[PDB]
Design a protein around this nucleic acid. Structure first.
Ligand SMILES: [Mg+2]
Ligand SMILES: [Mg+2]
Ligand SMILES: [Zn+2]
Ligand SMILES: [Zn+2]
Ligand SMILES: [Zn+2]
Ligand SMILES: [Zn+2]
Lengths: 162, 162
DNA sequence: TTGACTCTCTTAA
DNA sequence: GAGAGTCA
DNA sequence: TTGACTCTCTTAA
DNA sequence: GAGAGTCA
């Protein structure tokens, strides 16, 4: 809604409902050959999802609340950050999953940062493998690794230098 | 269609033209506090770009050659890799700039890999900062660093546990 | 055969 | 990663 | 009011 | 990060 008290009330009912999502334990790589344990509060795969929740995409959901007879709606992972600036350096703030588990709505697994910072975590070495993120990663990104490059830098002639 | 010999001729004419693009010397971070030097062969900001080159987008260009009366066209950074597999692990191969300079067409600054591998380089610590890419980075990714997270994981109540 | 424009599409966040 | 509309 | 669906859009590779 | 069309 508009007031601070109204925003807090939305965050509180959101936390309460998400707090009832089935909790799944996920064992994850932390980097440095170590492994950790995360507890994700996962939104159901099909309706009903929970009071105020509806799916707008294969892995997109929205939280809806009627305040003064007028309905307000937000991306499902954005609610915890309603009181924070919605941009940083002219870039939109986005819900970033430290657990890299889209269905998870655990606010302890979420941060609010630019889409670039958000995507970048996919390749982070992890909390025990060299992560330098100021708001630290909970695990090594799923895409961290040597890659699978088909062909590297090369030239046929002698017109170029590195 | 085009024989291997014909493709080689296209790569050679491409190298010849790009070789004449302004060569710009850039001082870049390599990771681990070290600075390096990269020499980029940059396509002009406006027409004419060079023989065979035309702009199809703000920072997208194509290379075109007519052989035996049939017109052939390729993404401008894809020519060096015309004789390589065009997919890997079921993913389309894409032109990845080891120099992170879009206008650059120096083949010694390009590699051929999946879009995920491609993007991930934006956050790499660099060849002197811990890069683990099998086809090593030439520099530290422009987006590597602490990031600028606005708000971290948090909860108002006690419904959650990490 | 070529140059200089036009257009829409792909991926995963 | 987001926005909003259509029905019941 | 609340739920369960539908659509298209943004970003930067 | 891409493929393809128009026009002279
Ligand atoms: Mg994410
Ligand atoms: Mg790139
Ligand atoms: Zn989680
Ligand atoms: Zn990290
Ligand atoms: Zn370059
Ligand atoms: Zn690297």
């Amino acid at each position: 809604a508009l007031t601070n008290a109204q925003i807090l009330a939305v965050i509180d009912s959101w936390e309460e409902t998400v707090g009832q999502f089935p909790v799944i334990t996920h064992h994850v790589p932390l980097g440095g050959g170590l492994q950790g344990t995360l507890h994700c509060y996962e939104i159901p795969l099909a309706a009903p999802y929970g009071v105020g929740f509806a799916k707008n995409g294969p892995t997109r959901w929205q939280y809806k609340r009627t305040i003064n007879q007028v309905v307000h709606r937000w991306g499902s992972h954005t609610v915890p950050f309603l009181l924070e600036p919605d941009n940083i350096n002219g870039k939109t703030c986005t819900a970033s999953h430290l657990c890299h588990n889209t269905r998870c709505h655990n606010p302890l697994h979420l941060c609010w940062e630019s889409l670039d910072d958000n995507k970048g975590r996919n390749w982070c070495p992890g909390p025990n493998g060299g992560c330098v993120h100021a708001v630290v990663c909970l695990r090594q990104g799923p895409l961290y690794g040597p890659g699978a490059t088909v062909a590297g830098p090369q030239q046929r002639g002698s017109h170029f230098v590195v």
